[PDB]
Amino acid sequence: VRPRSDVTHKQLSAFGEYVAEILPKYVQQVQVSCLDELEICIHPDGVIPTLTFLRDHTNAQFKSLADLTAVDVPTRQNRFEIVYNLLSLRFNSRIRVKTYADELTPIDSIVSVHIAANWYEREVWDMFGVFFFNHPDLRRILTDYGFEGHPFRKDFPLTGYVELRYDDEVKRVVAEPVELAQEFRKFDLNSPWEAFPA
Amino acid sequence: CMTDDP
Amino acid sequence: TNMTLNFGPQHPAAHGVLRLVLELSGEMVRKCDPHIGLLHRGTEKLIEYKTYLQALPYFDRLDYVSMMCNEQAYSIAVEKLLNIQPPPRAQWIRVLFGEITRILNHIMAVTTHALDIGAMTPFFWMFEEREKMFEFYERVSGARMHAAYIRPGGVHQDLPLGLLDDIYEFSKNFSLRIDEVEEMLTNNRIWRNRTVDIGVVTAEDALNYGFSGVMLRGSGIQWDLRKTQPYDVYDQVEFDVPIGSRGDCYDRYLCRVEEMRQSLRIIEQCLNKMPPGEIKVDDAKVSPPKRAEMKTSMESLIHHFKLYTEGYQVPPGATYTAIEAPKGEFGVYLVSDGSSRPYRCKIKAPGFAHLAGLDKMSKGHMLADVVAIIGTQDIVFGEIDR
Amino acid sequence: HAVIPHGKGGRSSVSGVVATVFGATGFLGRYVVNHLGRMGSQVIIPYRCDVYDIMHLRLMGDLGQLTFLEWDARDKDSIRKAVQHSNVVINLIGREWETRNFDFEDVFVNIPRAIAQASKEAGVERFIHVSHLNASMKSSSKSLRSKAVGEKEVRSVFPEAIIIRPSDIFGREDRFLNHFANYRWFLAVPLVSLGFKTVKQPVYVADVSKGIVNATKDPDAVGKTFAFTGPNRYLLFHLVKYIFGMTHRTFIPYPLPLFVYSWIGKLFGLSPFEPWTTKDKVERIHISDVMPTDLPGLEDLGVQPTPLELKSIEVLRRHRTYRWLSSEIEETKPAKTVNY
Amino acid sequence: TYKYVNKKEVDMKSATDNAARILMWTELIRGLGMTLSYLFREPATINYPFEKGPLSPRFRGEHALRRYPSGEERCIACKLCEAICPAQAITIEAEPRADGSRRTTRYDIDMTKCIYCGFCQEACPVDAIVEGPNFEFSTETHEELLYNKEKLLNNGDKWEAEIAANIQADYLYR
Amino acid sequence: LDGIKDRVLYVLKLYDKIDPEKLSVNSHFMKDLGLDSLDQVEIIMAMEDEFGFEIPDIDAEKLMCPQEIVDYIAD
Amino acid sequence: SRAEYVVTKLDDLINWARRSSLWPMTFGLACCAVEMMHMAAPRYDMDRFGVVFRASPRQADVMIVAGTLTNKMAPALRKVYDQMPEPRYVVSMGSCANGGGYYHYSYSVVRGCDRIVPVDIYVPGCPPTAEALLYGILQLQRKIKREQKLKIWYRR
Amino acid sequence: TSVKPIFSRDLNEAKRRVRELYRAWYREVPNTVHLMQLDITVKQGRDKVREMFMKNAHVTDPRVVDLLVIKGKMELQETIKVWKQRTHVMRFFHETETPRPKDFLSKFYMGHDP
Numbered sequence A: 001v002r003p004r005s006d007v008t009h010k011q012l013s014a015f016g017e018y019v020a021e022i023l024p025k026y027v028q029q030v031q032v033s034c035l036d037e038l039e040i041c042i043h044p045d046g047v048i049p050t051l052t053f054l055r056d057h058t059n060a061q062f063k064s065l066a067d068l069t070a071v072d073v074p075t076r077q078n079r080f081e082i083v084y085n086l087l088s089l090r091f092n093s094r095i096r097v098k099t100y101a102d103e104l105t106p107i108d109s110i111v112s113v114h115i116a117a118n119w120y121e122r123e124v125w126d127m128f129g130v131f132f133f134n135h136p137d138l139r140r141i142l143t144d145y146g147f148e149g150h151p152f153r154k155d156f157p158l159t160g161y162v163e164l165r166y167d168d169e170v171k172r173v174v175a176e177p178v179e180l181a182q183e184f185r186k187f188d189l190n191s192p193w194e195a196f197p198a
Numbered sequence B: 001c002m003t004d005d006p
Numbered sequence C: 001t002n003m004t005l006n007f008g009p010q011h012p013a014a015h016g017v018l019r020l021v022l023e024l025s026g027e028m029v030r031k032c033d034p035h036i037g038l039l040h041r042g043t044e045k046l047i048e049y050k051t052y053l054q055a056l057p058y059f060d061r062l063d064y065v066s067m068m069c070n071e072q073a074y075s076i077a078v079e080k081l082l083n084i085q086p087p088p089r090a091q092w093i094r095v096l097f098g099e100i101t102r103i104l105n106h107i108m109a110v111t112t113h114a115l116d117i118g119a120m121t122p123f124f125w126m127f128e129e130r131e132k133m134f135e136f137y138e139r140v141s142g143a144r145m146h147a148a149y150i151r152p153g154g155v156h157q158d159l160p161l162g163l164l165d166d167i168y169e170f171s172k173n174f175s176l177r178i179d180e181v182e183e184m185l186t187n188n189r190i191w192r193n194r195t196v197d198i199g200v201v202t203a204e205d206a207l208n209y210g211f212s213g214v215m216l217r218g219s220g221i222q223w224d225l226r227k228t229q230p231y232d233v234y235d236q237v238e239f240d241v242p243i244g245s246r247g248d249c250y251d252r253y254l255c256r257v258e259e260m261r262q263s264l265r266i267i268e269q270c271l272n273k274m275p276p277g278e279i280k281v282d283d284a285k286v287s288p289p290k291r292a293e294m295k296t297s298m299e300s301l302i303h304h305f306k307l308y309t310e311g312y313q314v315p316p317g318a319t320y321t322a323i324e325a326p327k328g329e330f331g332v333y334l335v336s337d338g339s340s341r342p343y344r345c346k347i348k349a350p351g352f353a354h355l356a357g358l359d360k361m362s363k364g365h366m367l368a369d370v371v372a373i374i375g376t377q378d379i380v381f382g383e384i385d386r
Numbered sequence D: 001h002a003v004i005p006h007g008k009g010g011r012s013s014v015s016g017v018v019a020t021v022f023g024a025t026g027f028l029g030r031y032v033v034n035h036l037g038r039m040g041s042q043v044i045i046p047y048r049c050d051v052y053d054i055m056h057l058r059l060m061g062d063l064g065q066l067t068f069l070e071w072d073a074r075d076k077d078s079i080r081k082a083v084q085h086s087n088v089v090i091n092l093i094g095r096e097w098e099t100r101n102f103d104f105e106d107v108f109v110n111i112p113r114a115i116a117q118a119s120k121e122a123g124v125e126r127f128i129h130v131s132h133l134n135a136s137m138k139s140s141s142k143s144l145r146s147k148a149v150g151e152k153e154v155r156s157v158f159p160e161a162i163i164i165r166p167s168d169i170f171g172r173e174d175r176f177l178n179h180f181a182n183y184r185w186f187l188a189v190p191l192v193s194l195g196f197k198t199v200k201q202p203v204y205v206a207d208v209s210k211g212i213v214n215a216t217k218d219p220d221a222v223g224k225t226f227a228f229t230g231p232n233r234y235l236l237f238h239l240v241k242y243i244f245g246m247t248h249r250t251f252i253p254y255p256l257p258l259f260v261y262s263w264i265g266k267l268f269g270l271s272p273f274e275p276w277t278t279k280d281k282v283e284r285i286h287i288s289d290v291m292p293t294d295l296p297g298l299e300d301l302g303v304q305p306t307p308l309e310l311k312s313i314e315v316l317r318r319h320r321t322y323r324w325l326s327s328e329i330e331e332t333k334p335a336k337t338v339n340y
Numbered sequence E: 001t002y003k004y005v006n007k008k009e010v011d012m013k014s015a016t017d018n019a020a021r022i023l024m025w026t027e028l029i030r031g032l033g034m035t036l037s038y039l040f041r042e043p044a045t046i047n048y049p050f051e052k053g054p055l056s057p058r059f060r061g062e063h064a065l066r067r068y069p070s071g072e073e074r075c076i077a078c079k080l081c082e083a084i085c086p087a088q089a090i091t092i093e094a095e096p097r098a099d100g101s102r103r104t105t106r107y108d109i110d111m112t113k114c115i116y117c118g119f120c121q122e123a124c125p126v127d128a129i130v131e132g133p134n135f136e137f138s139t140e141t142h143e144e145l146l147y148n149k150e151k152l153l154n155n156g157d158k159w160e161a162e163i164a165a166n167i168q169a170d171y172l173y174r
Numbered sequence F: 001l002d003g004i005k006d007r008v009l010y011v012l013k014l015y016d017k018i019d020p021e022k023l024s025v026n027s028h029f030m031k032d033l034g035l036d037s038l039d040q041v042e043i044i045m046a047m048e049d050e051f052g053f054e055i056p057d058i059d060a061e062k063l064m065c066p067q068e069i070v071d072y073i074a075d
Numbered sequence G: 001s002r003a004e005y006v007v008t009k010l011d012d013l014i015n016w017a018r019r020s021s022l023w024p025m026t027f028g029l030a031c032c033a034v035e036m037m038h039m040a041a042p043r044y045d046m047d048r049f050g051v052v053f054r055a056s057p058r059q060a061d062v063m064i065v066a067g068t069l070t071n072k073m074a075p076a077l078r079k080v081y082d083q084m085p086e087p088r089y090v091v092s093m094g095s096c097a098n099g100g101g102y103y104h105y106s107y108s109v110v111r112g113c114d115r116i117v118p119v120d121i122y123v124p125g126c127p128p129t130a131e132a133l134l135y136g137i138l139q140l141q142r143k144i145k146r147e148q149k150l151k152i153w154y155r156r
Numbered sequence H: 001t002s003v004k005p006i007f008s009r010d011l012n013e014a015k016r017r018v019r020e021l022y023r024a025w026y027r028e029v030p031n032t033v034h035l036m037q038l039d040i041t042v043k044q045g046r047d048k049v050r051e052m053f054m055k056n057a058h059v060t061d062p063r064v065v066d067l068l069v070i071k072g073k074m075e076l077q078e079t080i081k082v083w084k085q086r087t088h089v090m091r092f093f094h095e096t097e098t099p100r101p102k103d104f105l106s107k108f109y110m111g112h113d114p
């Protein structure tokens, strides 16, 4: 059993209401989950406003952006779930603000609020395809220069569709449709028996 | 030196 | 194009692979646009198709200078999701090898920094000490680096009977080895010049660009996730964070030499106070059963078979757990469905943020300055590219 | 004996052609192994060059597709084991300079016979033998005549053995195109009859290769003597200048009697290390391309020839200078076509 | 607890001291002394072929399949070594041997795919697949690195004596 | 003033995917020539190179008439 | 005097020179680079064997590809392989470069460097042990010793 | 229906942007074929540009067209600045790959699953 300190669960819950009241407009759900982490969920339009309040509020200074990520729940209408994890060196706490973005409904960029996001937002576009308005220079960071398709999307094949080899005839590296010599063995692992939720 | 025994 | 010149992927100066498309008016750098992904390999997507225990080896490869400290971050994360915590001896071990690993990273960062600067003898001096440390890894895990020793429920196997004594002899002496490097670089009439007042980063700007590492500590911001948010038993030890002022390449360096010193203080304690006990959780549910038990008890075989073939079956949830990896804050955001294989595992790499800062650090600087600044960020392209 | 063809068509797929190819290391060869490997065929490449040189061929073949065997032409046993398990044998053995220990007969007629001879003993389904175009048993160049001698013999050792007969080949690393371009070193570029009355029809190497490969996988070709020729003929004059044109190097065609010139070829021939020109080469160079009245090769075997000007830029680029290296073929003027 | 790594009168004595440091390069000479000192220390290198860097019993090294003393190969094709391999390296297909027992018709470890994690060593119930001590198996051709049951069984027979000693030393720990 | 039409006519026939002797000043690229929307774009660009003046993104949309192009170029 | 003998001896000399002094150009893609820096380091001195610590893409006799050869880096590897001298060699190091390694099924990793550069010695192991690389470099030395370039010239 | 717009409010405005990009590429094709020493013909390349710009001619929705040119503009910026090399540009031409026939009889003769 982990050493939970209820002292935290309460204080972070209380801040979650604080933020919910301060910004009734964009906060949809706030919840301090077990594991004692607070996640304020905001409408995509509240990206700029909710972050700024956290970066510049005396009672909630959240100066650095730990991470910007986008889980992809294909079932969810709004496929991506942009998650921003922020740290507060003054109150030694962490909060996560998560929004929802569909493939062709872009989110605002927070490079203004935190310049850390300049790179992570490019990372989210390259892997998942979400677009960030007002971004200084959005362009693929991790994928190859000519890569077609957004890789971390759940609908993208792991091996992908193209692989590279050197061809003598043309004396230059050349893509070809992927041909694998031992396909990824897809072990089915889920057990047909559940675990009675505690 | 896996085993110190010759 | 102001003579745009790719720093080039193959360059001894560029750690690993870095194309820095730089436009330089003669020997002055006007703008640095680092290119990344020369080492993207898919580590984040591959993990979704693998079970929790078979994704542990990926973390060692994310930033392999710091082989284990990275594991601890996934461990902690998977332990939180399961609400299980490791046994007392395992915790001390992880702090013991957590620190040994910090030294290993700093010996790389300080000595590799010098090799690019042009000092080559410090690298050979300390790579011999590194070597000796690797041997600890090997005699504990089996592998010199890429051990897989720190698993999600504790470490894998107790320390060999005799390691602690040797992690003492070494520690008892390593100091002098750090001292030597010093007599060679800390006050060199020339190290200072190429390092002092190069890449100064303000305190407000360091927090803003998410630097979170020595890079923040070097600017005078006091933040060590190991003291602010204790993980494992780094709370029971006593160490001094080496904060810096006049943050610049030289100051941060001094900080990295000082944490090498402070880690020897933490290692000493761990050897002095490591408890008798088990090194893995007793829940066969999360930790694999001992081989004598699985070969004599039916419940243990069933638990061995299911654990290795299927998996932990972590309860559904999501967590961001960050430790203080030698480079800086290493965090895993591990979203998890009830399944035995994860759903997402964004690895926050202290390094994706640091590189971004290269632009705001190396401004109006010469070609040689860029080489010095890539060194003062300890960029391991594995963590950045993931 | 066969291998059902499974796969999508690229590397790591199977086509079922196990083929010994004795002279693969060659300029043509390199290409033959390329397609055979691309298609997924099993390729056995006999070699007598050192292993370091054979390395270039390893990468185009997929894992286990390419097998390399040590082989000596004088030793009959080596040819025997190479064709043991092949069902297709392709012979590209040829040279321009009669070497100390191998005569034109050997490289063209003697050896290529023993090879097909064994292939039959083995029971290979088909043998493809390659001999130069316009090869009369009476042609001036010993080379061409000797080659002619071979295409006959091998018939008797191996009946219904395809005999593709390519023209001089156009391709990167070829001689036809590079040789002329390399005349730069020579201040003046001798051209018999001032490069006239020796109309020549080049053929891209790949076209030749693809053609050859297609032969291996087609029942229509048996005893066929195809002639891969090209998409356009040329008087040697335009060819020479054109080359120099893309190379962007001056041209001074100079008339020099073939009589005296055969002597220049003799001079280089004298050189120990791979003579650059050959008395025979000289003659061959002037031997006018013959018109086409034989079994159609390209197109007939399935590949549409590729014009010289199209890929010339790639073959002649290395010969340009610091700036000329940046010129492209369409701003350049393409030389006229003389069918004659 | 924090510490200031670099946080900071002018007297002739002081200045003259400082000026001498710049003028006659005093600290630079200090650095030369350190390297001259080691020049006199014994070098730490080992004759690689003649002397070998020490590896203790858990070293993972090269894969081998063990056999029972009697001579019956240990593997019983439960195939969870395949299940837990992180890289998909091990491929196993099995059928009941005429004896009626259960054995693997094909066991192929692709060593180029393998990342030498040592979990297979961990997972096997009969402990048939073990991480053998040898690390020197560099091969001229890629195909040689792919290993079928016969190479691994042969690898097992060659190194069985040391593998048995190594497992003997570390089994109490596991 | 006609010199412009002289040049404009020369540019239209030279690309050779249009005006095979059906070139007319009243002729409209989209209306009767059938040349594609994109091809027109190529045309306007072409005219820009010979004229030495680059016409804006939009006004290309209004002129599908060579004669109207000469009208605008003269301005 | 038989030239054949004269030739073999000469070849050997040539082989001894290339095999004694192999100046490696290492890439350090990934981590197996850390295990090579260890070779260069004091326990297992590469120099003692004549292998220089490091050289540029030109003066380099052997290229050691350590680490994953990702699809973006694949065009470069080739360039640098193509920018080396006429007597050149490639020692693939690491399961990530021998084949694909832990990242074989990924979309951004070339499944092996021998698909982009011809490879002469494949050194196995996720962090192939430094001694193992040293074993691999020594096997390249035995591969060169056996090469007989001039005798084939003479017999050709 | 009822969808928030990305860059243009209607296909009309969007098409304006496509025109601009076409021009951009059209003006760029020649330069690339020279700065990359590619062995292609400017005319040939310019047709390729047309190919791509039409491969996606069917899109009717304004939002999809806007992101397509968002992607398109970054493509030419990497094409320019020579971030893409010859190997990444030529890939567009699919030069090495063997073309597959689409005739039923052709497929029948070769692949199990067409």
Ligand SMILES: NC(=O)C1=CN([C@@H]2O[C@H](COP(=O)(O)OP(=O)(O)OC[C@H]3O[C@@H](n4cnc5c(N)ncnc54)[C@H](OP(=O)(O)O)[C@@H]3O)[C@@H](O)[C@H]2O)C=CC1
Pocket: D022, D023, D024, D025, D026, D027, D028, D029, D048, D049, D073, D092, D093, D094, D095, D096, D102, D106, D107, D130, D131, D132, D133, D165, D166, D167, D168, D169, D170, D174, D175, D176, G156
């Ligand atoms: N343009 C052209 O080159 C034309 C060629 N041809 C014919 O096509 C064939 C292929 O041409 P190409 O590839 O250019 O010829 P090459 O000069 O490249 O030689 C072809 C191969 O034959 C091998 N070879 C040569 N001599 C011997 C020998 N005595 N014993 C064993 N092997 C030998 C060579 O290997 P190694 O060098 O390793 O010994 C080489 O790899 C030739 O036989 C030629 O007659 C016909 C018309 C035009």
Ligand code: SF4
Pocket: E074, E075, E076, E077, E078, E079, E080, E081, E082, E092, E123, E124, E125, E126, E127, E128, E129
């Ligand atoms: S686990 Fe041990 S026994 Fe079961 S299959 Fe793999 S190897 Fe054979």
Ligand code: SF4
Pocket: C061, C064, C146, E115, G030, G031, G032, G066, G067, G068, G093, G094, G095, G096, G097, G101, G102, G125, G126, G127, G128
């Ligand atoms: S092989 Fe193992 S070690 Fe070498 S790079 Fe790939 S992962 Fe890192």
